[PDB]
Amino acid sequence: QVTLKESGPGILQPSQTLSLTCSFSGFSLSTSGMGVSWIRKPSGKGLEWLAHIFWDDDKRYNPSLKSRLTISKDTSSNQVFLMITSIDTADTATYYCARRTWLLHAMDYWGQGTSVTVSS
Amino acid sequence: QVTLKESGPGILQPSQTLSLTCSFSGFSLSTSGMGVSWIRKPSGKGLEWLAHIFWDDDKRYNPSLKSRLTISKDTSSNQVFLMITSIDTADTATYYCARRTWLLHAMDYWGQGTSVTVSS
Amino acid sequence: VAKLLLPTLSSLAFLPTVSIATKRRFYMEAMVYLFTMFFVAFSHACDGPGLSVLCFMRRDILEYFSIYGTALSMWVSLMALADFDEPQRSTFTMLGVLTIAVRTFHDRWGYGVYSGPIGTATLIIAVKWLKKMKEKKGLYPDKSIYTQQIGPGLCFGALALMLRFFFEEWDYTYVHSFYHCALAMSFVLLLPKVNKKAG
Amino acid sequence: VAKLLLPTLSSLAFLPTVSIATKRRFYMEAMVYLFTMFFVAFSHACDGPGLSVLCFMRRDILEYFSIYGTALSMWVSLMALADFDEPQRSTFTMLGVLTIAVRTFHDRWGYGVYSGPIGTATLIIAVKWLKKMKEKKGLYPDKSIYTQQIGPGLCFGALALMLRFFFEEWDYTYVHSFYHCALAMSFVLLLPKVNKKAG
Amino acid sequence: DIQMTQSPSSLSASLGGKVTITCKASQDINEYIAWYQHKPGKGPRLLIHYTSTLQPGIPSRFSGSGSGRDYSFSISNLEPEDIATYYCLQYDNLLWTFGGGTKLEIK
Amino acid sequence: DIQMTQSPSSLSASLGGKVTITCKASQDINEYIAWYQHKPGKGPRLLIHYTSTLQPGIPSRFSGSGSGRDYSFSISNLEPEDIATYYCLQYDNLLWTFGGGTKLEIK
Ligand SMILES: CC(C)CCC[C@@H](C)[C@H]1CC[C@H]2[C@@H]3CC=C4C[C@@H](O)CC[C@]4(C)[C@H]3CC[C@]12C
Ligand SMILES: CC(C)CCC[C@@H](C)[C@H]1CC[C@H]2[C@@H]3CC=C4C[C@@H](O)CC[C@]4(C)[C@H]3CC[C@]12C
Ligand SMILES: [Zn+2]
Ligand SMILES: [Zn+2]
């Protein structure tokens, strides 16, 4: 069966880097037409898309955060990493890793999500 | 030369009828394709169209005021009359009578306008 | 006697196509299908010896606009499937109209009279959908549209072509009548579910 | 010698029409004008004894698509002026295409081959503009559009028709060459200032 | 971006009942809308994609409709396992945008 | 109705200078836009109609342009007699709607 599982720091103070990790099984991201995507639910708010990374080493970012997001890969490990630079307390959210395919362009599996709380 | 000239009460208390009159010369409203129209500038505000009356005895009103406006004619007198029912202090405006044609559908002559002030 | 009537009556297989195209606001396609249905039907009526008295115009006209209408019906079915935006939509319509007219008028029985439109329209669709698949990073027309419209529509299309241009060597009366039904069904299936430029 | 070259060279009077139609995003009209320019030019080249060796297709084809292209050029000029919204825009285009095709193929030298399109398109324009004048309660196309486009465009149109179908009895070489220039200018003037459905 | 507008922010309904959620896009999304069911402490499930296609294994009460800029999603013969938050996804562009969500409640 | 949006509510300019007023319609008005000059204690004058056509007798500095939903009006070699309020009229429908106006001032 397909799985994704997120990992993170849980707590950081503002004005540093949030280094989120996603580990997956039942697929490989180097499989043709395969994609992994990041979504967050901010504290008491609706879902917000962050980043895409693809089989052909292509990437996209949300224009609202394109300046501070960075997404990277490790197929050897079956892993993807999202770096969010210059943390604000607005980044208080649950962060999800979700798998997209070639035949349906929307994501079809999500991870359980990792809660990240950021304040002094 | 074309002229239009407006007449009115100047002052009324609210919750009665404003009976505006327009008299004109240099044209007849029973001439083919000829029209007369009413516009008001409310107190410290931009222009607002009220009513049309036409050569073929056709009429239009502004949907915001269509319930309380009524427009009527007298070619014998070269005159048009606008009745505005149930006066509010929002009707504090200068009221203009303007002549529209068949070849240009916009109004080409205005009267000087009559100031109507309405309060207790 | 089947020889006269069956190819003439099977020509009315395009009347469901005209009806369905009209219902989905594809009025320009419905004109081309109705024009085709008329000239295909009257070409068969005029050829059948027992009702050849019926035809009010000469064989040369009915034969030409049977073939022209058929080839243009194939073009506007595939250009409706390509689903172009303006100003290309009308340009691609006019391209088929003018090139099918000159080709058919040069030789209505020559090579390229049906394979020219089908081959050119396939190449146009393939280039558009492959560009859109690189944009989408995924299968562009939904797997529903492939399995419900394109797959079945091209199956009835390929069946119609091999009925007319291979199996018709064995028999005419029944095989040509089945070609009308297969091509009418192909036009119905290849046509989208509503004209997005009119509704 | 003028007899051969002047009607062949005056056929390039439609090249400004193709250029101007392309510049205003009227691509479907620009196709019909270019197609017409080609078949009109090669019909005159193929007729002229001293360069009749040039033509690569038979007289019957060049003669047909000279006449068909001319009548369709008149139709798409007036349908561009009518300025229809979809789904009628493509329906009215297809109506001219199919009815001019059947009529010209029946008799390319018969009555109604040019007056059919011009008369039908005039009736369609007149009905649309009179409906719009009742809606506007005023002259619908602005007095600028009448004095700059419609008046001049129909003056060059009427001049072209009476050059070809009255004055051509007196002379061919110069009168027919003036007909090309008058009809090209008529198409330029009757065409709106930009395609509002593409820009 | 494209803004997705789920009309009920929250909706209360009886068990065995019927529920409809409506969504308006600020620009046409060419039927590339998908519907997700989300529960506290779990990852969202894909119910429906390309407006109407149910994901395999998804109970057939879930339906979706619309084409152009206006879409809708519905639950019929509502079970207590349907008490969840429902999100629409615009995925016409790779600039993905979700709706505000619809929190379903019992009555 | 159709909403007409004159961009400068007021504008200050030097005598002999050049001024441009811009207007956006909420829906296309098919070039049926007219521009009026209005002065305290006088009836408005029609300057320009159908986007660009100057009314006869109107000094030729006044120009107007646009087609679709965006129009503009300009004064060149500005005279002290141009110090007035300028209104655009939408007259595509007999439901007439004016812009908010543009009050021109000296500098
Ligand atoms: C969009 C346009 C191109 C639609 C297609 C038009 C079709 C009917 C025409 C245009 C030019 C035609 C070609 C012209 C001449 C020949 C020679 C013949 O021995 C084989 C077919 C072939 C090669 C034709 C195939 C059909 C063709 C491609
Ligand atoms: C939109 C369509 C109708 C465009 C016009 C098509 C033209 C080319 C055709 C369609 C039917 C044609 C008519 C058919 C037959 C004749 C008989 C002939 O003795 C006089 C002309 C006349 C009466 C034709 C005039 C031209 C005509 C109106
Ligand atoms: Zn047949
Ligand atoms: Zn010629």
XYZ file of C-alpha atoms in Angstrom, chain A residues 37 39 41 45-49 52 54 60 62-63 96 100 104-108 110-112, chain E residues 32 34 36 38 41-46 49 55 87 89 91 94-101:
46
model
C 3.358 18.093 -2.861
C 0.042 21.582 1.974
C -3.574 23.980 7.525
C -7.845 28.416 8.949
C -8.493 26.523 5.637
C -5.823 24.529 3.674
C -2.935 26.367 1.862
C -0.783 24.738 -0.917
C 5.416 20.659 -5.779
C 8.179 15.931 -9.679
C 6.688 24.814 -8.280
C 3.067 29.256 -4.024
C 3.716 32.882 -5.232
C 1.039 17.635 5.158
C 0.096 13.290 -6.974
C -5.267 12.087 -11.908
C -3.372 15.425 -11.499
C -4.805 16.037 -7.956
C -3.148 14.358 -4.885
C -4.619 10.868 -4.056
C -1.867 12.357 2.180
C 0.322 11.752 5.261
C -1.209 12.170 8.784
C -10.531 20.163 -12.725
C -11.607 17.494 -6.598
C -11.501 15.807 -0.010
C -10.777 15.482 6.375
C -5.917 13.380 13.583
C -6.072 11.783 10.049
C -4.874 12.671 6.492
C -7.597 13.843 4.008
C -9.247 11.189 1.711
C -9.901 11.954 -2.014
C -12.025 14.189 -8.964
C -12.307 7.425 -6.404
C -12.599 20.749 1.053
C -9.434 21.690 -4.678
C -6.187 21.854 -9.826
C -0.322 23.665 -10.837
C -0.988 26.808 -8.702
C -3.358 24.630 -6.543
C -6.006 26.478 -4.415
C -8.420 24.877 -1.853
C -11.837 26.210 -0.730
C -12.378 27.492 2.860
C -13.837 24.055 3.847
